[PDB]
From a paper:
CIII2 is a dimer with each monomer comprised of three subunits: the Rieske FeS (FeS) protein with a [2Fe-2S] cluster, cyt b with hemes bH and bL, and cyt c1 with heme c1 cofactors. The FeS protein external domain (FeS-ED) is mobile between the b (close to heme bL) and c (close to heme c1) positions. In R. capsulatus, both the diffusible cyt c2 and the membrane-anchored cyt cy carry electrons from CIII2 to CIV in respiration. Here we report the cryo-electron microscopic (cryo-EM) structure of this functional bc1-cbb3-type SC (CIII2CIV, at 5.2 Å resolution), together with three structural conformers of native CIII2 (at 3.3–4.2 Å resolution).
When similar analyses were carried out without imposing C2 symmetry, three distinct maps were obtained for CIII2 (CIII2 c-c, CIII2 b-c, and CIII2 b-b at 3.8, 4.2, and 3.5 Å resolutions, respectively). These maps were superimposable with respect to cyt b and cyt c1 subunits, except for the FeS-ED portions. The CIII2 structures depicted by the CIII2 b-b and CIII2 c-c maps exhibited overall C2 symmetry, but in the former the FeS-EDs were located in b, whereas in the latter in c position. To better define the clusters of cyt domain of cy, the docking analyses were repeated using the three different conformers of native CIII2 (CIII2 b-b, c-c, and b-c). However, when the FeS-EDs are in b position (CIII2 b-b), such models were more spread out. In CIII2CIV both FeS-EDs being in the b position, we assumed that cyt domain of cy docks similarly to that seen with CIII2 b-b and that spreading of docking originates from the variable conformations of the FeS-EDs in SC.
Residue numbers in the entry:
A (entry chain D), B (entry chain Q): 5 to 107, 126 to 257
C (entry chain C), D (entry chain P): 2 to 232, 237 to 428
E (entry chain E), F (entry chain R): 11 to 191
The structure:
Amino acid sequence: PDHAFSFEGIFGKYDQAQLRRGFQVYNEVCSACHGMKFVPIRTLADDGGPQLDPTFVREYAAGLDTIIDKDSGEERDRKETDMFPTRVGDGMGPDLSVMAKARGGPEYIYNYVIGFEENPECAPEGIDGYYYNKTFQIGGVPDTCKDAAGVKITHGSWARMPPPLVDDQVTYEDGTPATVDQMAQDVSAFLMWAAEPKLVARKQMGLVAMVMLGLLSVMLYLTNKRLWAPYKGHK
Amino acid sequence: PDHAFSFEGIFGKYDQAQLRRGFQVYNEVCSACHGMKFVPIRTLADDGGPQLDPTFVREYAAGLDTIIDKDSGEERDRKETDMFPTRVGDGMGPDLSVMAKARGGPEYIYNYVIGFEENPECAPEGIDGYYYNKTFQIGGVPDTCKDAAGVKITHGSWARMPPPLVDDQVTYEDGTPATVDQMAQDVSAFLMWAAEPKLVARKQMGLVAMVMLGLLSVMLYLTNKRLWAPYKGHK
Amino acid sequence: SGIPHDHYEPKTGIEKWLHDRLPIVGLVYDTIMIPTPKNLNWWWIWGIVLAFTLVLQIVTGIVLAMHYTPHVDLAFASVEHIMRDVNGGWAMRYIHANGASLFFLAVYIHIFRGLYYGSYKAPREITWIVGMVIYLLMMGTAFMGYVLPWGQMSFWGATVITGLFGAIPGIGPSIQAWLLGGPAVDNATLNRFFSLHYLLPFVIAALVAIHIWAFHTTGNNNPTGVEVRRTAEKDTLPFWPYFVIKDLFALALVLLGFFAVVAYMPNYLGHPDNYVQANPLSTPAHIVPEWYFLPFYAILRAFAADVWVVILVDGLTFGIVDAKFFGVIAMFGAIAVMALAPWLDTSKVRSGAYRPKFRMWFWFLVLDFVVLTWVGAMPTEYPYDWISLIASTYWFAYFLVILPLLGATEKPEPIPASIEEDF
Amino acid sequence: SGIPHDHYEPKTGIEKWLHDRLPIVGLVYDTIMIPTPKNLNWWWIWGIVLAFTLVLQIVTGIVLAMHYTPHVDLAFASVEHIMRDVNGGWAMRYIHANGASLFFLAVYIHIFRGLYYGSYKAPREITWIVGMVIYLLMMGTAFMGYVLPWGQMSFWGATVITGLFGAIPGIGPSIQAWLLGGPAVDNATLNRFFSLHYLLPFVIAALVAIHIWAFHTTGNNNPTGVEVRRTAEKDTLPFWPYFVIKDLFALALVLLGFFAVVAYMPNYLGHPDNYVQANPLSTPAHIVPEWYFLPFYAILRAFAADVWVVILVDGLTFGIVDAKFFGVIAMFGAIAVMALAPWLDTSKVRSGAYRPKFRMWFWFLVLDFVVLTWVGAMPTEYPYDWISLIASTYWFAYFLVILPLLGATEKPEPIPASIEEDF
Amino acid sequence: RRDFLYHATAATGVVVTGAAVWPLINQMNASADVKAMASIFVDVSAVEVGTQLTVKWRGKPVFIRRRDEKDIELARSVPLGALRDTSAENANKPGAEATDENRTLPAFDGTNTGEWLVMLGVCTHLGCVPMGDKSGDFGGWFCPCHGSHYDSAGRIRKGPAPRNLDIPVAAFVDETTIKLG
Amino acid sequence: RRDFLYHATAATGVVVTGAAVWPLINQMNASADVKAMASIFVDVSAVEVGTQLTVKWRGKPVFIRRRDEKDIELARSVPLGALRDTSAENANKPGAEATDENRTLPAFDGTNTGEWLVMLGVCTHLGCVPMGDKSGDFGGWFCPCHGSHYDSAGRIRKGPAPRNLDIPVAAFVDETTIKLG
Ligand code: HEC
Ligand code: HEC
Ligand code: HEC
Ligand code: HEC
Ligand code: HEC
Ligand code: HEC
Ligand code: FES
Ligand code: FES
């Protein structure tokens, strides 16, 4: 049905293979236009998410663009301590660091990446340079598709992003059918990581605190029932 | 004698012709190596110092180096709202924004610029690439000039700055003998401006406050003498 | 009567040399063994909740300020530094952000408990005044604080809630510029807000000092229209340990729910658009400032000369009182009248548990509050305009006319004596 | 005796409805009409000076924080933004920076006034304890504050006065890292210090609250070893208006001198090297932290195993108590012993105006303080080492041994009766 | 005298207090670095006349939009009647009626007005940025903060916003430039 | 029971309080962004052997200075006696005696030690930066914060500083490079 993720609930600590797949997808597809400045590269070793091997992290970092410096202007080797690059303009898009919170979030990305079908039977010609999406709601609409008072008759609208993937864009090393849907789910989970890395710690803290406070509250209820006994016994 | 400046005292609001002369020298001599980032270009119209004509300020600004931008990387027109440029390295020196306070201050600059005489009769060969200054005290000294326990026998030491001026380096438009000493005094005053622009306001506030508080204190003394009278009259 | 029982410092030599600094005398005699009635329901706990929440917010803020950098170019980045690198991070931020929500929720129940059981009625005016002063301070605080992340909603909320001050004539733009540090919003506003936001809580604590001093000198309301009968008072058990433990039990429950939220539903009360950096060149849809200011936002954006009950066309008699100024006055009055209440209710009576008509009107008032909360988020298109106008009109009507009429003809009830209600 | 004269709230209806919140009762009965002796010299003013200076610092700081940006890359720039663009700028900064100097100068005279006229003697111990606590808080505050400009002296002063905590064994490096936010100094330290620096003053005010509560409950010391003779007390005029006006006159004079300084000699008490940005790679000569910490700096850097009176070679018996730790303990003890004084002076007597030997030793102590101040700035080369050792030894000797011996054999003086000294 | 001396001391204290307080209220005013508030040269430079052009200045956007005939005719067909603000807020001229002939813009150093219109993109209600690109119920701009409908020429309509979109002082630089200030 | 129940409630309250307090004391510890604390490759690259070379790392300077014969002979002529710290703080080897043979540095991937010496430019007293370029009363480094005289090889002398200048873990990169970390 709704294709719920793993983390959608009181449990679900970010199944990591899914995140490694999303990383294969993000660095080879989405990175061409998008960036994640709010994301340090070293986080690809921190627990909770992709617990990759540090050495591979340093390699992948040195293999990225050149972030010059802060003290002496000079194109450095881009050490992991720096942040992911930033694609800013000239046919590029926003930053995906926290896009999983600026919208139930990841379901938006899934049902957005999912859905770029051809132009409907109201404006088949479409638009030059703009492509159609069935779920983006903040895009333009031709006058042919609007109602009598400016509202659109289409489910979604026209987004400036092209279709990101075809039937079998990339291979998975673990062994898995790399259709469009699985890639969309995986990349959605990866972005949710990039936004909420400390999710599992959140849940564990919540459990511990609920327990301890229920205990404290029960003990206080007993103490209250006791103290207030000689005044609530005859009635 | 000590060649006291105008501002050296309870008065002396920064004789401005001196500062215009110091500016003629700073932009044509010292600017080649030094900078003043902590100094906006729009201060050359603010009262207290050189009350130059704004239009000349905009011209002189556009005639300087190119300070690119903060939002969109692109070499602009170096608008006055920006700050003076910065010469950083490769044969360059520190920033003179507040050098008049990081040392009685301006007298250091005067007696420093003043004094680059030839090497003394202890090490006439000197050093390659370093030149000698009578008053700088934080420079190296050859072993031939040090005493038995590392202390130098010279008044000053060897500074990395070359002699900045000759007998008649530049002309003054107002009409004045532009010898080295006058230029040194003028540029010292200009730097003191660049460091303490709000000097005259300081002095005027001090005067006003001294006066008002002396008045208040006198009135309170009278009130005290009165109240405490019937208890200090028999003795 | 009012037994203070100073303890006479008879314990031992330690309690006798403490005759230099009385402090323990104060605590014991007054702030612990303060006779409180037996008839207290579960609505007299929320003050402890508010005190604890205030302490919590102050602490978490003092911690955050060790990593927040007030500047347009480094605020968002510092917030992410917090939520990612720092050890506890997300906890402090979520506890700070949501705890504000609980704070205001708790003051709402604290205030409406008061309106019911005549806690504003004499001789308890000072407490009411101080409480309204506080409410104002804490609203201003939360506002200054929502700005610091320099998200997208921050900018525009600040923009509008500062254009308010500029609406008024003659001294509007001057105040606007003096408050923003300039013509529009920029880092200067951010610095002001951070400082101010890091200072008012202490003023609030002091005001809470006077708040607690007042209702210790003046007896706690009690469910009925009766006092502790000082003249020895078998009623009025002490505070410690009974009511302390009761309040702590309720507080444990509340914190349990609060942490469950923090850990499972933390981004629920927030606005996602506050997770995208600011663009002074693009405004998002449905700014929707927050949820503890929607009532007054609606009272403001209701009066627009778009109804047959539009008093703006009539207020235009004077060419100076335009619409904007009218809405601003309406909001300031919505609060000033709540403050003036104790001198409007012309009743020599007390808790509405013995005033039926008052019960009905009061529940209508609670409903009006909820409705205003729900309306400030919805557009100004029909029919919501009529709804907002009706609700604001009823608020003002209640607080101005309804209470006098009741105080006149509202005594068909047998008042209870003997605050010792052994039923 | 101890006439409070509550005023009975008999003024009028306003002073009768104020029976809800007592506040004016407190002010009048206690904090304004507090009977103070007639025998007060000009040394009992500096408390008013300290209160005013504290208010001044708090205000100026709240103003500066509207323009200061805590970050290594934008602190210096913000300070210059202040001293150049802002309207008042230089005034606030110079008044903030120098007022700290006056604050400490005034506490020095406040403290030494106390040591003379037996103000630490019973029954005034609590005031002394609270005062030492304050002194500590305000030292830490000024330290945290000297760092914010991110000049050159800031960095290195912080470096050393944090390496202190690391000197001790076992738990030194851990505390060092937990305090600096890391192995060495960086923006994290700056944020901590700013927050902390913007918070302690309020704790100080509260502690000043208790400071004022104590010596109102306990009578002000007086030049004589006598009390106000409570049993009606023709002596002991009230505070208002007499002593209020006297203190305000002295305060006007002091502010006059202070503003003359601010306007003519503002950069005199400062270190020029704090006007050059920081270089973690280059250290200047003669860091010379400040002038209100030189005594303890010298007591610290004196013990180095470089004198025949070097007790470090003897303390090396235990392999853990090295030199550094010894100096740190010596400083902490230099303060702890001053705090312990009231239980070391074994004299059933009071103000040294009737104890000659005490006068001589006390003036030697003042001289020792001045000498230590002058020595912390000069290198550790001969002869200054012997001087510092002698001075520290005398400080400890005074406070440990000298007072007992006096209390034993120090009563060749006729004590004065009748605090009404109509001479 | 008792009265004179006491009251005069009080007066002097009050005066000094006020002289000390004023700067604490003056520092929060616009500083000299904000005093600047100068001009900007935006180059129209063929941006495909008819859609829009926005540029930052003074901390607010300055809308430079070409004209689309349908937008024009809708403009020129608006009688002053039923027009909330008929003052033509544009400060490059007097309080002349809010007419499209005066309200569009100078004429490139030539003679024509129904082709360009540069106004301050700041809603007069409380300062929000209306959405452009043909929006609202009048084929112009729509403010999403409270719902104020602007018209083609920028005159306010259908909302709380009292007045139209102001027009700063601007002249042309000989057919490819705009001077804002 | 009275005692058991009351004391247990108190204990639970205390435990919860402590569990809530600990993080308020944990957040001030080094954060993950400070956890990194990794390496740096400094290239000697002919900097005129004999004067000095300083580089930033970990927030502290790392001194890389070539050797001057007079400096060397003064070093090699120091018996362990009269040497405050004889531990050879260098962490690239065991606690072997603070001898110049062990204390100078690895040998370029070759066989020689009396030519390079890279130590941590941080005074062990309280962390100041000593001045180099032949200074002090021993022809080495001088700390201006309190007056600590270092020797040629960096061993502490004539001051409060208890130990010499440590030596981080470093190896060579085949005759033109240094690896710090
Ligand atoms: C350029 C060829 C792109 C690549 C490849 C990807 N994206 Fe992108 N994206 C691009 C643009 C120009 C825009 C803006 C669209 C607009 O109409 O404004 C976007 C937008 C997105 C968004 C935001 C959608 C929204 O509601 O605002 C998302 C969530 C997004 N894109 C996701 C995404 C992913 C996961 C990609 C890799 C699989 C990816 N995009 C590639 C440009 C380009
Ligand atoms: C390069 C050709 C220079 C020009 C022209 C000027 N200065 Fe300079 N200056 C330069 C260097 C490389 C240094 C550093 C010297 C050192 O040994 O470190 C300096 C230094 C100064 C100083 C600081 C002196 C001190 O005590 O640290 C001052 C006050 C100074 N210079 C002044 C100055 C003036 C007024 C100039 C124009 C008349 C000027 N300098 C020109 C490099 C160069
Ligand atoms: C010691 C400092 C401090 C105190 C005290 C404090 N806060 Fe804050 N507050 C901050 C900081 C820092 C931020 C920005 C970081 C953040 O948003 O969590 C902030 C942000 C906020 C936010 C926005 C939260 C977000 O994430 O957008 C709100 C709402 C808020 N404060 C309300 C309050 C209220 C209400 C009080 C007390 C009455 C209070 N704060 C006490 C420091 C403090
Ligand atoms: C605008 C009104 C208002 C506000 C806001 C308010 N109070 Fe009260 N408070 C009252 C009134 C009325 C009473 C009843 C006093 C009485 O019964 O004598 C009261 C009572 C109390 C009590 C004792 C009885 C009780 O209800 O728990 C406490 C404790 C208390 N308040 C704390 C607080 C704190 C802490 C805050 C804010 C941080 C706060 N209050 C805000 C008006 C207010
Ligand atoms: C509300 C904030 C605030 C308060 C309260 C405050 N200060 Fe500061 N302080 C600052 C700021 C901001 C700076 C940095 C700007 C500066 O140096 O003037 C600073 C800097 C300092 C400095 C260094 C001055 C300089 O220019 O180098 C000292 C010393 C100092 N504070 C001491 C104190 C003491 C002592 C107190 C009270 C006991 C105090 N401050 C109260 C905000 C405050
Ligand atoms: C370490 C000691 C110490 C410190 C520091 C200290 N005090 Fe005092 N203070 C005393 C003592 C002792 C007395 C004498 C009390 C008495 O005579 O009963 C006193 C008395 C006073 C008095 C009343 C008589 C007088 O001397 O003026 C005031 C007011 C006062 N202090 C204010 C302050 C303030 C404000 C501060 C700090 C901001 C401060 N003090 C710091 C110890 C201290
Ligand atoms: S702000 Fe533009 S309409 Fe309300
Ligand atoms: S810090 Fe290096 S010797 Fe004191």
